């Protein structure tokens, strides 16, 4: 019913793992789009909610998930924006499908243990 944040990061922490392990398909989520960097003014207009795995981690590691679809949600949010914004025979998209699989493959049981 109610999460101790501790055990929640400890759940979840394996799934966000196996995300970063993923090499090369997690190098475009590992930290924020830049779009000023990137030179994508567009970005934003497309993109309103950005989410990375950097923001992921540090939302997991600092409690700011009360509850584990909260974390679900936001895994999916990152995955949304960049199938959205990118072409899909692009890298990041074909990227992105990647760690939907493994992510897909990783939150079933988690999910299920976690009530």
Known sequence: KIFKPEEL???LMPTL???????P???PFRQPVD???LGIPDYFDIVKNPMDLSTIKRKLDTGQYQ???QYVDDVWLMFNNAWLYNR???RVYKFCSKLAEV???EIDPVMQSLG
């Open 9 to 11: 990061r400890q759940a």
């Open 17 to 23: 793992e196996a995300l970063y392990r993923q090499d």
């Open 25 to 27: 398909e997690s190098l």
């Open 35 to 37: 779009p000023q960097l």
């Open 67 to 69: 509850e584990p679809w």
């Open 88 to 90: 899909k025979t692009s």
């Open 103 to 105: 992510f897909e493959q």
